[PDB]
Every structure is written in C-alpha cells, then in structure tokens.
C-alpha cells in the first residue's frame, strides 16, 4: 500500500508537467525521427491530402483491320 501510494504520487507529479516527459532526452527526439524516417521509407512518401487522378487510354486495342477484312 505504501509503495503503491508513493508511485501514485510520483505519477501525479509526472502529470504535473506542462507537456512531454520530464526528461526530454538528448537522443529520444533523434530516435523518434529515425523511426519516423524508416516508417516513411517503408510505407512510401505520402502527402497530407494529395489525391491524383489520371486516366489512361485503351491499351493494346485489338481490331479487325487486316487486308482480308
């Protein structure tokens, strides 16, 4: 019970932070950036809302055009 209440108090202390971890970490941002770059490379580059729309023509149009037609 004593350890539980102590840890609850420290969790509330963590919640007292305005934002982010108390220890931001010199390498936490670098690791997050590396992971984000890896995810972007794996999943491919994507814009916020880009929705391209290009339609091709009929491919390999087969016809009856021949000398014996």
């Amino acid at each position: 019970q004593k350890l539980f209440v102590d840890k609850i108090r420290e969790y509330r202390t963590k919640r007292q932070t305005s934002g982010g971890p108390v220890d931001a970490g010199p390498e936490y941002q670098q690791d997050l950036d590396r992971e984000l770059f890896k995810l972007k490379q794996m999943y491919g580059k994507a814009d916020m809302n880009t929705f391209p729309n290009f339609t091709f023509e009929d491919p390999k149009f087969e016809a009856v055009e021949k000398p014996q037609s």
């Binding site: 809302n49 929705f51 339609t55 023509e57 009929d58 149009f61 016809a63 009856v64 055009e65 037609s69």
Partner: protein, 55 residues
C-alpha cells in the same frame, strides 16, 4: 468504398471529413467505343455479295 464512414468512425476524422467531401466530387471517365462502326461497315458489303451469289 464504404471506408468514408469508417474514416468518420476512425479517430482521425476531422480533416478526413473535408477530404471525403473532396472524395465525393471525384469522377471517373468512361471510354468510348471506336471500332463499333467499323464492324457494322463490312456487313452491308457482305450482304450484297451474298445476294449476288444467291442469284
């Protein structure tokens, strides 16, 4: 294409709603047939040849 409702249910729904409004504005073209007249062209000549052969 029912993902738009799923996107609304998806937590990220706000700007996705505007994009869905854009999505409903999408239009897909329909190709137009070009060889249809060419096929119909030869039938008359073949019919004439058949009539001459019959006679």
């Amino acid at each position: 294409i029912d993902w738009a409702y799923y996107k609304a249910t998806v937590a990220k729904a706000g700007l996705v709603d505007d994009f869905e409004k854009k999505f409903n504005a999408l239009k897909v073209p329909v190709p137009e047939d070009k060889y249809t007249a060419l096929v119909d062209a030869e039938e008359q000549e073949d019919v004439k040849r058949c009539a001459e052969f019959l006679s």
